[PDB]
């Protein structure tokens, strides 16, 4: 036994994964996925360790830096989520890992908006969001998904 998936790692769909921030202990696991792409949702620069892993493995980094904010005073990062969705929906970028810091809020919102495009009823989207967010589930994240207009992606 030796592979360590990154924090809160899960398969979302064919060619799509979610997690928190990978560190060097996770690189041997991430190698088994044959990633083409990472969608990174934090504003902080990528560490040198991570950049060397991407360069060694031919993985493209897409960064859409969403500022972390806590309830009750939240950002509505609509443009950044939609830019990340545009990349996520292009199969040429697959396999793709979506990650933020812990993979609960920013990652959860992007995945929830994907589920809405996949025609999941809201309660099913929120159940999946809650499974990762656990005691840190935010009503604001779920309201963002409730309000999200799918029009431009149909
Ligand atoms: O209370 P805070 O000091 O603001 O801690 C919170 C932390 O919450 P706690 O550690 O106190 O529980 C959140 O973590 P979770 O709520 O996910 O447990 C985490 O946001 P997060 O890493 O969740 O961001 P996502 O990556 O899920 O968007 C926050 O990160 P952000 O600031 O959103 O990048 C803070 O973590 P940092 O300390 O690393 O900034
Ligand atoms: O520059 P603007 O045209 O006013 O648009 C901004 C801008 O959105 P994008 O840059 O992502 O297009 C903010 O992000 P920064 O430029 O500051 O990085 C964003 O903030 P978040 O990314 O945190 O959402 C904000 O959205 P909001 O104010 O709703 O949180 C949004 O403004 P509209 O919301 O486009 O005025």
């Amino acid at each position: 036994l030796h592979l360590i998936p990154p924090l809160n790692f899960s398969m979302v769909d064919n060619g799509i994964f979610r997690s928190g921030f990978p560190d060097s202990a996770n690189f041997s696991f991430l190698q088994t996925l044959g990633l083409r792409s990472i969608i990174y949702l934090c504003p902080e620069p990528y560490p040198e360790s991570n950049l060397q892993f991407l360069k060694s493995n031919g993985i493209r980094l897409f960064q859409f830096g969403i500022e972390g904010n806590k309830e009750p005073f939240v950002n509505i990062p609509d443009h950044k989520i939609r830019m990340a969705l545009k990349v996520l929906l292009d199969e040429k970028n697959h396999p793709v890992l979506i990650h933020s810091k812990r993979g609960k809020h920013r990652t959860g919102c992007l995945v929830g908006c994907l589920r809405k495009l996949q025609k999941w009823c809201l309660t099913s989207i929120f159940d999946e969001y809650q499974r990762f967010a656990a005691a840190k589930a935010r009503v604001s994240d779920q309201r963002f998904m409730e309000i999200f207009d799918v029009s431009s992606f149909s």
Side-chain angles (χ1 to χ4, degrees):
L1 302 188
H2 66 96
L3 299 177
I4 309 171
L7 191 66
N8 293 315
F9 172 78
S10 186
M11 198 160 188
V12 173
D13 214 324
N14 303 295
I16 307 173
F17 304 91
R18 61 181 290 167
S19 72
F21 211 119
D23 68 48
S24 61
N26 311 135
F27 295 168
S28 62
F29 176 75
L30 290 184
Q31 271 194 332
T32 71
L33 304 184
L35 296 177
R36 279 198 177 78
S37 306
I38 288 178
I39 294 171
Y40 170 46
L41 299 178
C42 307
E44 290 81 11
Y46 229 52
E48 185 48 44
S49 173
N50 296 74
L51 285 175
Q52 185 50 59
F53 173 72
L54 295 203
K55 191 187 177 190
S56 292
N57 284 272
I59 302 164
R60 306 204 315 181
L61 182 65
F62 299 92
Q63 182 171 11
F64 306 105
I66 300 171
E67 212 68 34
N69 286 281
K70 313 210 287 187
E71 294 204 297
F73 296 124
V74 304
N75 46 334
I76 312 301
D78 182 63
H79 192 204
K80 288 176 178 102
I81 289 293
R82 288 171 179 264
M83 286 189 288
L85 260 186
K86 199 64 158 297
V87 171
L88 186 54
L89 290 172
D90 178 1
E91 275 187 26
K92 292 184 301 298
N93 295 323
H94 295 191
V96 56
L97 171 66
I98 304 162
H99 83 80
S100 50
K101 186 172 293 194
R102 302 224 191 129
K104 294 182 204 178
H105 302 115
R106 288 167 288 194
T107 294
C109 284
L110 176 59
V111 171
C113 293
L114 172 66
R115 302 308 197 184
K116 199 174 184 182
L117 296 180
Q118 297 179 327
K119 303 310 176 24
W120 288 30
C121 79
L122 285 179
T123 52
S124 293
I125 300 176
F126 300 161
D127 175 59
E128 174 181 66
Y129 166 81
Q130 293 161 189
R131 181 190 307 145
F132 292 88
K136 296 310 228 63
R138 295 180 194 165
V139 179
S140 64
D141 290 335
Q142 294 169 93
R143 187 163 47 246
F144 176 85
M145 302 167 211
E146 182 175 11
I147 291 177
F148 188 84
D149 184 343
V150 301
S151 296
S152 300
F153 284 88
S154 323

